[PDB]
């Protein structure tokens, strides 16, 4: 559970993300792929990218970074009243894409790194503790949709 003070820090720094939603989701995916090469395998269209500046040249990489932030944006703007937005995602991500909850922790960490790296002052300790709590409850709620279907996470 997040206070409304906290939801505001969360959604106010997310507004920035949204000024450059590609730039961010790109950097996120790079951070995740470069840091966890295992994740790269779930996207057959980029599984071949081998270097950094190389994947920075990918339109579809950007296209996906723009996707994952846009949806997470939508979820964040629900302030946890986001079941009608996480039912489909948990299920797609557990079954179709076969993504474990460990990989979600990974991208949660990439996001946070990117926020810190793109907005240092605006994203201080208490703004970060807020962001961390949101992504954590996002993750816990997916985790339970995973479990309801017999996936573990
Ligand atoms: C913030 C956490 C995440 C969010 C909000 C997110 C969001 C989305 C959305 C909105 C889609 C659209 C397609 C669908 O749902 O059927 C999608 C698809 C997909 N997601 Fe995620 N995702 C997250 C984490 C991950 C991670 C960590 C991976 C892999 C390591 C992943 C792999 C995929 C793949 C492979 C697809 C299919 C894309 C394609 O088929 O071209 N997702 N995701």
Give the tags.
monomer, 153 residues, mainly alpha, globular, binds protoporphyrin IX containing FE
Summary?
It is classed as oxygen storage. With 153 residues, the protein is mostly helical.
Through-space gap between termini: 21 Å
Individual helix count: 8
Number of strands: 0
Assess the beta-strand content as a share of residues: under 5%
The CATH architecture designation is Orthogonal Bundle
CATH superfamily: Globins
CATH class: Mainly Alpha
Helix content: over 70%
Report the C-alpha radius of gyration, rounded. Answer: 15 Å
Fill in the CATH topology.
Answer: Globin-like
Structural class: mainly alpha
The biggest sheet, with number of strands, parallel, antiparallel or mixed sense and barrel status, is: none
Order of helices and strands: HHHHHHHH
Which small-molecule species are bound to the chains here? protoporphyrin IX containing FE
Overall geometry comes to globular
PDB class: oxygen storage
Keywords: Protein evolution, Ancestral protein, Diving adaptation, oxygen storage
Assembly: monomeric
Entry title: Ancestral myoglobin aMbSe of Enaliarctos relative (imidazol ligand)
């Amino acid at each position: 559970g997040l206070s409304d003070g906290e939801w505001q820090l969360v959604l106010n720094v997310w507004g920035k993300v949204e000024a450059d939603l590609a730039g961010h989701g790109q950097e996120v995916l790079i951070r995740l792929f470069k840091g966890h090469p295992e994740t790269l395998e779930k996207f057959d269209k980029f599984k071949h990218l081998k270097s950094e500046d190389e994947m920075k040249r990918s339109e579809d990489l950007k296209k996906h970074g723009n996707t994952v932030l846009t949806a997470l944006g939508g979820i964040l703007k629900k302030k946890g009243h986001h079941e009608a937005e996480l039912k489909p995602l948990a299920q797609s991500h557990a079954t179709k894409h076969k993504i474990p909850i460990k990989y979600l922790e990974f991208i949660s960490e990439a996001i946070i790194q990117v926020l810190q790296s793109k907005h240092p002052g605006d994203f201080g300790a208490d703004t970060q503790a807020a962001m961390k709590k949101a992504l954590e409850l996002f993750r816990n709620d997916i985790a339970a949709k995973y479990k309801e279907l017999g996936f573990q996470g």
